[PDB]
Amino acid sequence: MTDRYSFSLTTFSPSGKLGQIDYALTAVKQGVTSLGIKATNGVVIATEKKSSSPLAMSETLSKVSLLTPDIGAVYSGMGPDYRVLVDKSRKVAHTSYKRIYGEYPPTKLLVSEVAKIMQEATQSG
């Protein structure tokens, strides 16, 4: 066994494109529309609950997720990838911030931590 894929699966093509990132963006494009609007006294995020079947309970599938008491997230693209990112985003808000400073991270820094996780999947083996 062992993870014998210790090399990058995303690489620069001759034209300077990172194929797997472009293709990931293509998958996002196919995804259901979600949006965000910032007001003076608040922010709103919204999306369509595209129900795969009418027998399915769309309330159980939460596209909009609480990350911290003052931070929320919504997505477009592959749902399972989002779900695990939300779990990692929640945990990293505690391990790399709340357990150090005794308070929740500011929006920009939590975003930065999420961005780091996504960057690593773009370069790691």
Binding site: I100, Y101, G102, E103, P106, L109
Partner: protein, 204 residues
């Protein structure tokens, strides 16, 4: 033998009306031997002030560590750290060495830049926070300081009155402790100005 009383020294912090004050002696020793009369125990990171008593190598090490951490904090947050946040950082940092601790008695002091609220805090060597309204004491003459502060202190003192109170609390405590003294420094801290005063005291 006891690490917290090899080098000696004290720190005291008090709150006043729209101000805080933090003060320390200047002695560093090797038990009975006086080694330095310029060993300052109060440091600052932006507008947040940190006094550290105890084992001098750790006092130095922790200052360097909190400078390190507050500098990275500022670069990422794009703003200077606040006293309440820094207090939690000091607590976290000490407790991560739970079974091999720094032998120190830290004291945080400062004013919150947004709310303007005076703030002080103290810790044991292992990170337990003591957030008192009135005053925080630390060092080899902590008992003496507790006695001085408990009687001399009254709330809502003006900056120039508070100076007298904290100065007399420190001086008279240090004169009853063999391992403290050899000079003293007092910081008077207001929201956007800080005055640092060296006190004249007996040199033994």
């Amino acid at each position: 033998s006891d690490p917290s009383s090899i080098n000696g020294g004290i720190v005291v912090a008090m709150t006043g009306k729209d101000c805080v004050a933090i003060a320390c002696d200047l002695r560093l020793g090797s038990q009975s031997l006086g080694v330095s009369n310029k060993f300052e125990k109060i440091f600052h990171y932006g507008h947040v002030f940190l006094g550290i008593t105890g084992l001098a190598t750790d006092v130095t090490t922790l200052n360097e560590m909190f400078r390190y951490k507050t500098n990275l904090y500022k670069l990422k947050e794009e703003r200077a750290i606040e006293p309440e946040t820094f207090t939690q950082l000091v607590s976290s940092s000490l407790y991560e060495r739970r079974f091999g601790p720094y032998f120190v008695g830290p004291v945080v002091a400062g004013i919150n830049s947004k709310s303007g609220k005076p703030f002080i805090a103290g810790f044991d060597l292992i990170g337990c926070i003591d957030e008192a309204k009135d005053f925080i004491v630390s060092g080899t003459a902590s008992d003496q300081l507790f006695g001085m502060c408990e009687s001399l202190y009254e709330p809502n003192l003006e900056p120039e009155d508070l100076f007298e109170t904290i100065s007399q609390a420190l001086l008279n405590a240090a004169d009853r402790d063999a391992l403290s003294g050899w000079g003293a420094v007092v910081y008077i801290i207001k929201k956007d100005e800080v005055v640092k005063r060296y006190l004249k005291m007996r040199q033994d």
